[PDB]
Amino acid sequence: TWLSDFPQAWAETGGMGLAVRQAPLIIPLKATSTPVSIKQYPMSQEARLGIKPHIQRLLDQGILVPCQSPWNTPLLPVKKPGTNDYRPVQDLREVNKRVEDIHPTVPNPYNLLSGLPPSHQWYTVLDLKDAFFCLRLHPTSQPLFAFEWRDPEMGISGQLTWTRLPQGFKNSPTLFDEALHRDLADFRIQHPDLILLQYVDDLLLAATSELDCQQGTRALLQTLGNLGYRASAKKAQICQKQVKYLGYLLKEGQR
Amino acid sequence: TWLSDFPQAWAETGGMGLAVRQAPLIIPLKATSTPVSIKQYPMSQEARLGIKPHIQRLLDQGILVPCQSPWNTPLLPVKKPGTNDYRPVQDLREVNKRVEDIHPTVPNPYNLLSGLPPSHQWYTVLDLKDAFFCLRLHPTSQPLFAFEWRDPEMGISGQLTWTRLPQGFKNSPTLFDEALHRDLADFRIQHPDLILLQYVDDLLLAATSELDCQQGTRALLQTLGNLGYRASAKKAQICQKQVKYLGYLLKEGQR
DNA sequence: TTTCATTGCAATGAAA
DNA sequence: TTTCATTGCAATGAAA
Numbered sequence: 001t002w003l004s005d006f007p008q009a010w011a012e013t014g015g016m017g018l019a020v021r022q023a024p025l026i027i028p029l030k031a032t033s034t035p036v037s038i039k040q041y042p043m044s045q046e047a048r049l050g051i052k053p054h055i056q057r058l059l060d061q062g063i064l065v066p067c068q069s070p071w072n073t074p075l076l077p078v079k080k081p082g083t084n085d086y087r088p089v090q091d092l093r094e095v096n097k098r099v100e101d102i103h104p105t106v107p108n109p110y111n112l113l114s115g116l117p118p119s120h121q122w123y124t125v126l127d128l129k130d131a132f133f134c135l136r137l138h139p140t141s142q143p144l145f146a147f148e149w150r151d152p153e154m155g156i157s158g159q160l161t162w163t164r165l166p167q168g169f170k171n172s173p174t175l176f177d178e179a180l181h182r183d184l185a186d187f188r189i190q191h192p193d194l195i196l197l198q199y200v201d202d203l204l205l206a207a208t209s210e211l212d213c214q215q216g217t218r219a220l221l222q223t224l225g226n227l228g229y230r231a232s233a234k235k236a237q238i239c240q241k242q243v244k245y246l247g248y249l250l251k252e253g254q255r
Numbered sequence: 256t257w258l259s260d261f262p263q264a265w266a267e268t269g270g271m272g273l274a275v276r277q278a279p280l281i282i283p284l285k286a287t288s289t290p291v292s293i294k295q296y297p298m299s300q301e302a303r304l305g306i307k308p309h310i311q312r313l314l315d316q317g318i319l320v321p322c323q324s325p326w327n328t329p330l331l332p333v334k335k336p337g338t339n340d341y342r343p344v345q346d347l348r349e350v351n352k353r354v355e356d357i358h359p360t361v362p363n364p365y366n367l368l369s370g371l372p373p374s375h376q377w378y379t380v381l382d383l384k385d386a387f388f389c390l391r392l393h394p395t396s397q398p399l400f401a402f403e404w405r406d407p408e409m410g411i412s413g414q415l416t417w418t419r420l421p422q423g424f425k426n427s428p429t430l431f432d433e434a435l436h437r438d439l440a441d442f443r444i445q446h447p448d449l450i451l452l453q454y455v456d457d458l459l460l461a462a463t464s465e466l467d468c469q470q471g472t473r474a475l476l477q478t479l480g481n482l483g484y485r486a487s488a489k490k491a492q493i494c495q496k497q498v499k500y501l502g503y504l505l506k507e508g509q510r
Numbered sequence: 511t512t513t514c515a516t517t518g519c520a521a522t523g524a525a526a
Numbered sequence: 527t528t529t530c531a532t533t534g535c536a537a538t539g540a541a542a
Contacts, residue, residue: 041511076511076542091512091542168542296527331526331527346526346528423526 003233009225010233011129016061017230022179024138033098035070040148047077050086052152063133067161069143090147092168106177109246112197118253120195120206122213125237125245129230131201132165132172173200183227204245213239258488264480265488266384271316272485277434279393288353290325295403302332305341307407318388322416324398345402347423361432364501367452373508375450375461377468380492380500384485386456387420387427428455438482459500468494
């Protein structure tokens, strides 16, 4: 299908992404910040067991690495919405308070959609998978996001940290949005006729005709794969005249 | 003393007042009002006994009279501040809500005092006793303020009401202030040099010299007695250069 | 687990 | 006794 034509663009077949054109990110601290070390809260075995496979997988992917850092924040066991599956959720609030603020450049959905003309009725919606993880973290900034991990069988001494932009970090959405904007700048230039809306990891491609939407989508997927990002094939809405984007149902230029 | 020179002006020796020049007051109801009859709440014997002498005294003074009225509000036993003496307090709130509003013409103490020049350093302060009771209530408006009274030994069938402006009636302060202003208009004309401040029942006479304050005070007392009002001799502050008025301590034109 | 904020209302005070 | 309003905080929800 569209899946076979772009094996590298889909998370299903391209493997975990890595934005190769983006320099590892350095995270500036506020002028007065010093490391904060919050001890990990005791976790039930059920919670630890539920979370273990995820840490192992991230460790195998190299997204997490062992470390020793004066910084440390709590790992919280959080059951998926109503479900009984545990998911690791780092409380990075004390770290966020010590990181220098940046201007929020992500447009709110409402204003973003205003840039959608009635002429472009053919849409493609793509969701980038593990977007933040595609952006490398500079070695100097990695220690900042450390947390403790007590092994299952055996493995880690104590602390682990991220080598990619983390979930829970106040500036992750904005930094991802800006980096993807830089990586897709050229694409916008090569396709003056297409309408591309970016909302962090949620992308919408607007075209005038089914052919343009198809040709445009091929190029976009091709480009995304080459840059190192990965779109979810499962969720992909390709060349439809009716799509769901950012909580809206688009059709007939309405909404 | 000053007491003997004006027997009729002092509450101590002039008997209960009655503003003879003021026509009995008619109290206009709002366009949609109908009588409200709130049943009297059961009262302990202690409360009833504590309050009894006051009703009897008001009945003897003719300030209260028997009646039958479609209106009725509760009589509350209220102990004097921390003391164990009971005092009758009528809850006229439902009546107040049905009476047509009037413009509040009583000045707040702050603005009132601003009309006190530094030239007049000699002050006399008089407190009118049972001020509201000095103003008659027109027979047509009396029924409005009725309440129930269960006798001690014997006496009253059920309801009693006021023949004078009542405590607890939202418009009593303003109506008294305006009536006294009308009754003292002439006095202000005959004494252009004196400063007279009126705050409901609290009066302040300001003069330039001790003689003027003494002569002025004589005239004021004389006039008040003839009009039917009564000042408290016990509280009277006559021709002092330092007096307490409306919570302030006046001296050297300060405050 | 903590933190931060929205909500709701019990508790206490004033007054007629 | 009732009513009206100021205060305070317990309860519940969101989030990292």
